């Protein structure tokens, strides 16, 4: 007599299926990774500055040094706990200081270089020697403030800021990620670029993208570093910049939900189309799923969690087309590559959005 009992709620059921599991997945049982204890923080910060102020032949392990600084900031055992909670059985190998040899330092003791598992000593030694040679050449040419030295306390945060820029585009492609990182770091990291005029952003960004791809648990470690940095009472300008970029990375992989919220706020009349009305129930279910997951829903695609994909609006072609049309009408869409199912709805929504933006009204 009434069609009120015809209701399914499949997305809630799929989320309940996925989340309510009594068995944990075990991955990377035989793999190992390296961390650095907080005591070596100084000895990593200095090295973190050596990648910046010299031209280096290779930048394979810059991202690993940034992650090492993250480990020093959080603590080695806390990093073990982070990696274990991420679903990985990776075993930490501990960073160790080793004497280089007969080489003597300015303090009179043996020159102690860092030993990081998975990073060959040749790369670290070459970085150290190249940075020292660049410093010697600069001193010979001209005779260097504190903020232009590798020992500056904020150099690891600058390296990690390049890392955070590449992190923001982890749901995009590697070429687009590198291009956006270079373009944004020319402006975002402009003061650091003036202090260190020969830090090679493209290769450091490439190293960070490689690290984020090979070691997925390092995404979780990076997110925990951002969370722990955002909860501190004080910090430097570099750390505030890092947390700003990190928060800019938040809703990555879910720009369609944000553009749908924008389209609703834009009062697009083509949302009233009967094709769109026929599908809005599942759209509301997706948004309700976001509310159910809560704050951690935004980090789903960044963490590369398999549960991501429940938030997809790809089974609402009318809603997606109207949302993309509204995005194009306001000029927001840019070079978004999201496919447009229905071209008629896209064009109509674009026309209405251009009409609304070009015109002005008072309420």
């Amino acid at each position: 007599m009434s069609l009120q009992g015809i209701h399914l709620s499949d997305l809630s059921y799929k989320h309940a299926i996925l989340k309510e599991s009594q068995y944990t997945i075990k991955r990377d049982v035989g793999t190992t990774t390296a961390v650095t204890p907080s005591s070596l923080q100084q000895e990593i910060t200095l090295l973190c500055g050596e990648i910046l102020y010299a031209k280096h032949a290779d930048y394979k392990y810059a991202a690993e040094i940034g992650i090492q600084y993250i480990s020093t900031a959080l603590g080695s055992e806390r990093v073990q706990q982070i990696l274990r909670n991420s679903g990985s059985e990776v075993q930490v190998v501990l960073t160790r200081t080793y004497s280089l040899g007969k080489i003597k330092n300015n303090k009179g003791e043996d020159l102690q270089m860092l030993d990081i598992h998975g990073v060959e000593k040749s790369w670290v030694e070459e970085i150290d020697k190249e940075a020292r040679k660049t410093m010697a050449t600069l001193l010979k040419e001209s005779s260097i403030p504190q903020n232009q030295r590798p020992s500056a306390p904020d150099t690891p945060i600058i390296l990690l800021c390049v890392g955070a820029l590449i992190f923001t585009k982890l749901a995009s492609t590697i070429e687009v990620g590198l291009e956006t990182t270079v373009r944004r770091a020319n402006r975002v990291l402009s003061d650091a670029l003036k202090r260190y005029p020969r830090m090679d952003i493209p290769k450091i960004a490439r190293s960070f993208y490689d690290l984020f791809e090979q070691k997925v648990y390092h995404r979780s470690l990076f997110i925990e570093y951002g969370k722990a940095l955002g909860s501190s009472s004080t910090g430097s300008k570099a750390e505030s910049l890092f947390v700003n970029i990190f928060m800019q990375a938040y809703g990555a992989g879910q720009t369609m939900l944000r553009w749908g919220v924008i389209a609703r706020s834009s009062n697009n009349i083509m949302l009233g189309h009967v094709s769109v009305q026929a599908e809005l129930k599942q759209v509301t279910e997706v948004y309700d799923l976001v509310r159910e997951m809560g704050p951690e829903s935004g980090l789903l695609h960044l963490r590369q969690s398999p549960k991501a994909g429940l938030l997809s609006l790809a089974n609402c072609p009318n809603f997606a087309s109207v949302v993309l049309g509204n995005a194009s009408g306001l000029g927001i869409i840019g070079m978004y590559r999201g496919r447009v199912p229905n071209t008629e709805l896209f064009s109509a929504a674009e026309s209405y959005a251009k009409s609304l933006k070009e015109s002005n009204k008072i309420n």
Partner: peptide, 7 residues
């Protein structure tokens, strides 16, 4: 004198 730099 490369390794004697202040750094």
């Amino acid at each position: 004198d490369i390794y004697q730099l202040i750094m």
